């Protein structure tokens, strides 16, 4: 609201919070980000390092859907499944290893972060990490690829 604004408390104050030596003229610095090279260099160079200049390689008409690839960590794999299918395991005495279709929960890749519960699994994904391979293998379980 206008009610709680410092512009109320600046009534009867001549300069209105802008100082009477150097008044609030219109545009003293420049207009916008203007003068990155000249006379604003200390800012752009000490707060935005790497602003000015080209780098890398042009890829004209990029489309994100080509390179779309979400990721899961093994940290939260048994979250994609209802936790009861995990409780209907570590039990059942048969080596059930329920199937987890990482594709169905919207992830085209499984990465190897975090601990994994000592439990057999079948993980269907598109692209695996190497360590995510070894974490599932070493727990006892398979890595199954899907197209």
- 123, 127, 72: which is closest to 100 by C-alpha? 123
Rg of the chain, C-alpha, whole Å? 29
Tokens of 42: 């200390």
**Residue (39 or 76) nearer to Mg ion, CB:** 39
Which window, 10-18, 52-60, 62-70, 71-79, contacts another protein (CB under 8 A)? Answer: 62-70
CA dist., res. 107 & res. 103, Å (int):
5
Are 97 and 142 in contact, with CB atoms under 8 Å apart? yes
Q: Interface mask (CB under 8 A) for another protein, residues 91-110, using x and -?
A: -x-xxxxxx-x-xx------
Is position 52 an interface residue for another protein (rule: CB under 8 A)?
no
Residues 12-51, interacting with another protein (CB under 8 A): 27-30, 32-33, 40, 43-44, 47-48, 51
- For residue 134, the SS3 value is helix
Binding site for Mg ion (CB under 5 A): 20, 23
Binder of residue 97, out of RNA, another protein, Mg ion, none (CB less than 5 to 8 A by kind): another protein
């Amino acid at each position: 609201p206008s009610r709680l604004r410092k512009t109320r408390k600046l009534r009867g104050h001549v300069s209105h919070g802008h100082g009477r030596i150097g008044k609030h003229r219109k545009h003293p610095g420049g207009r916008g980000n203007a003068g990155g090279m000249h006379h604003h260099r200390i800012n752009f160079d000490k707060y935005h390092p790497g602003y000015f200049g080209k780098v890398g390689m042009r890829h004209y008409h990029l489309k994100r859907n080509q390179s779309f690839c979400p990721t899961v960590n093994l940290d939260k794999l048994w979250t994609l499944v209802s936790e009861q299918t995990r409780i209907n395991a570590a039990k059942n005495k048969t080596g059930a290893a329920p199937i987890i279709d990482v594709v169905r929960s919207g992830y085209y890749k499984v990465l190897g972060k975090g601990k994994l519960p000592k439990q057999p699994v079948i993980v269907k994904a598109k692209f695996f990490s190497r360590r995510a391979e070894e974490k599932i293998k070493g727990v006892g379980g398979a890595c199954v690829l899907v197209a």
